[PDB]
Structure formats: C-alpha cells, structure tokens
From Swiss-Prot:
Cystine bridges: 26-84, 40-95, 58-110, 65-72
Any one Gene Ontology molecular-function term assigned to this protein's record: lyase activity
UniProt family annotation: Belongs to the pancreatic ribonuclease family.
One Gene Ontology term, aspect cellular component: extracellular region
Active site feature: 12, 119
EC identifiers of the protein: 4.6.1.18
Superkingdom to which the source organism belongs: Eukaryota
Binding site for substrate: 7, 10, 41-45, 66, 85
Protein name: Ribonuclease pancreatic
Gene: RNASE1
Residue positions with a glycan: 1, 7, 34, 37, 41
Length: 124
C-alpha cells in the first residue's frame, strides 16, 4: 500500500525545481510519478515548494472542498505550480501533456494525525 500522504507527495510535490523547466516537463513528470500508468491522468498539478510549506497549508485558510466536505485549506500566499493538462494526439499509452507554469494559491484537503495534505483540490 501507499499512504494518502505519500501518494500526495508522489503526485503533487516537486521541490527540486522552482518552476516548470520547459515544454518537456509534464511528459517526463507524469510518466516518472506513474501518473500515466493505467490511463493518462487527464490533469495534474505539481507544487514547487518545500514540503514543510505545503503541509503548513493545513493550518491556513479553511474553505469548502469541491465535493462539499469541509476539510480543504487555501494557502495565504501564492505558490509556484505547474499544471499538466493532456493534449489531443495524447493517446494511451502515449500520453501527451502541455506544461503550464504559474503562481497561485493552492487548495488542499487535509486529514489524519498529524493533519497532512492528502488531496489537491484546486488552485486560484
């Protein structure tokens, strides 16, 4: 198994880079993190912040999750993120993505003890 928290770091954390390196970023990252293993995950966001910074988001601004649950939190400051959105010629198993860099507040769902991020909800 893989814990909720470890899975979040696997699919969303990329601290080794401050931004989206190039157009190549998403094709390599999605594959590396095994996000294009059973299908091409449609969209995925990577956060280039320290892990301590992303975890502190659980004590930040509490907001409603897209699913109606109340365990989502919004970062007070903008973070550096990269959005990976699937393309047209992207055909499984040859998934193709468009790398998109930006700075936005992130919204994550937290849970557990300790209370850690387990799901990425949105970026605004």
């Amino acid at each position: 198994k893989e814990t909720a928290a470890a899975k979040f770091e696997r699919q969303h954390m990329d601290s080794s880079t401050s931004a989206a390196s190039s157009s190549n970023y998403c094709n390599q990252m999605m594959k590396s993190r095994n996000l294009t293993k059973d299908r091409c995950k449609p969209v995925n966001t990577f956060v280039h912040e320290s892990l301590a910074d992303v975890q502190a988001v659980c004590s930040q601004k509490n907001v409603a999750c897209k699913n109606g649950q109340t365990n989502c939190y919004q970062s007070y400051s903008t973070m550096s993120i990269t959005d990976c959105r699937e393309t047209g010629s992207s055909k499984y198993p040859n998934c193709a993505y468009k790398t998109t860099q930006a700075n936005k507040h992130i919204i994550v769902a937290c849970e557990g003890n300790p209370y850690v991020p387990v799901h990425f909800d949105a970026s605004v």
